[PDB]
């Protein structure tokens, strides 16, 4: 009974401290938004950002290679599991490389250094419908009413509320919904076109719902801000497009289902790749290893493999290594306690900087060891934490 009371108390404390942390994030976001919006006029922004079809140039017989690639002007739809090309234009920091474009190891060295200097980032923003606006408003108001009742019922958590506010005011550094983060380490490119893959699940492992998605590109330059301050960015958003899961439509069209016939299994991949979705050969290779007695391929297993993350990444988590992937929740918790109140947008903007700082400079506070960590909160206190040790 005492343990249950302690657990309830800890849950109430967590709720009240989160409620106290909520306004700091909003005020910091407002301040950094003001600092950002007062900056683009002085700097040079990106004038145009467009999304085009992925180039699959396989030159036929009699076709020379020096011909420039052909790309579509625009696309009104982004399939949930397809590839895309984004085109932008920027200032002199890349026209210098455009000059230097016109066979030596040191030449490639200096070209690579100039490539390293640049920095780009791509994100996706979903427009929120009014129904979702009011649906989230009612949920958040219910939660804050519940936390108010929690504060009322026990005349002790008011002190913790004020202490949390003071601690956040002493720790915090002084200064339309994010959907998924695309390639973050994208650098300045010769052709100003970047290839991106949209994953089925976002950073939090949930599918992306129906909505109008806008591609927002933010450009960084290390010459001005070497600390990667989120305020100093060149921000440009493209026109909204529709995103949906084309897999049910494609499978229904192809099959006119639970077991894909073995004979017609292979043409289905060609149909998918014609429709625009990309299916790795490894994915199909090990999808064909789980067939039934007759040879039919399990459609649900193939779909799970296709939407899985091991075979193909989103070019953002691909840059992150397995160690960073393992310690990412710890970095998330430390980031949200250092900056009281945060969300996916700011976490994605500061994603790789903090991870590289943690896994390069510190490398020891994170990267849990074998004797100071607990791998199961219900087993660590008994098995791994014997009272002798």
């Amino acid at each position: 009974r005492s343990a249950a009371n302690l657990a309830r108390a800890e849950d109430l404390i967590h709720a009240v401290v989160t409620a106290a942390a909520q306004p700091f994030g909003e005020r910091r976001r407002a301040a950094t938004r003001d600092l950002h919006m007062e900056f683009q006029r002085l700097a040079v922004p990106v004038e145009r950002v467009i999304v085009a079809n992925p180039v699959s140039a396989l030159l036929e017989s009699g076709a020379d290679p020096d011909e420039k690639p052909v790309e579509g002007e625009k696309v009104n739809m982004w399939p949930l599991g397809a590839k895309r090309v984004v085109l932008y234009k920027w200032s002199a920091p890349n026209v210098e490389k455009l000059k230097a474009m016109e066979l030596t190891a040191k030449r490639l060295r200096e070209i690579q250094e100039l490539k390293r200097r640049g920095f780009l980032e791509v994100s996706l923003w979903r427009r929120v419908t009014a129904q979702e606006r009011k649906q989230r408003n009612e949920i958040v108001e219910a939660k804050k009413k519940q936390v108010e009742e929690v504060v009322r019922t026990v005349p002790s958590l008011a002190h913790l509320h004020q202490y949390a506010t003071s601690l956040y005011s002493r720790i915090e550094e002084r200064v339309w919904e994010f959907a998924v983060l695309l390639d973050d380490r994208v650098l300045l490119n010769k052709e100003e076109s970047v290839e991106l893959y949209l994953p089925y699940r976002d950073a939090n492992g949930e599918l992306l719902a129906q909505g109008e998605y806008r591609a927002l590109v933010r450009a960084f330059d290390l010459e001005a801000n070497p600390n990667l301050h989120p305020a100093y960015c060149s921000v440009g958003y493209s026109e909204s497009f529709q995103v949906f899961d084309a897999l049910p439509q494609l499978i229904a069209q192809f099959f006119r289902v639970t077991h894909i016939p073995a004979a017609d299994f292979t043409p289905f991949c060609a149909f998918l790749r014609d429709a625009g979705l990309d299916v790795p050969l490894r994915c199909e290779f090990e999808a064909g290893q789980a067939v039934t007695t007759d040879g039919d391929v399990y459609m649900d297993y193939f779909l799970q493999l296709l939407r899985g993350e091991a075979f193909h990444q989103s070019h953002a988590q691909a840059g992150l290594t397995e160690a960073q992937r393992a310690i990412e929740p710890l970095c998330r918790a430390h980031w949200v306690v250092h900056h009281p109140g945060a969300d996916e947008s700011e976490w994605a903007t500061a994603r790789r900087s903090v991870l590289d700082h943690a896994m390069q400079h510190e490398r020891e506070w994170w990267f849990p060891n074998e004797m100071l960590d607990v791998k199961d909160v219900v087993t660590g206190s008994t098995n791994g934490l014997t009272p002798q040790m």
Binding site: P155, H159, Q162, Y163, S166, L167, R170
Partner: peptide, 29 residues
């Protein structure tokens, strides 16, 4: 310890009657 409110600061140190009195005064005010 140092950044904590005085109620928490003195409740971590075993003084419980003083902590209760301070909490009562604070909830009164």
């Amino acid at each position: 310890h140092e950044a904590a409110t005085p109620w928490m600061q003195l409740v971590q140190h075993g003084k419980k009657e003083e902590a209760a009195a301070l909490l009562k005064e604070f909830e009164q005010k």
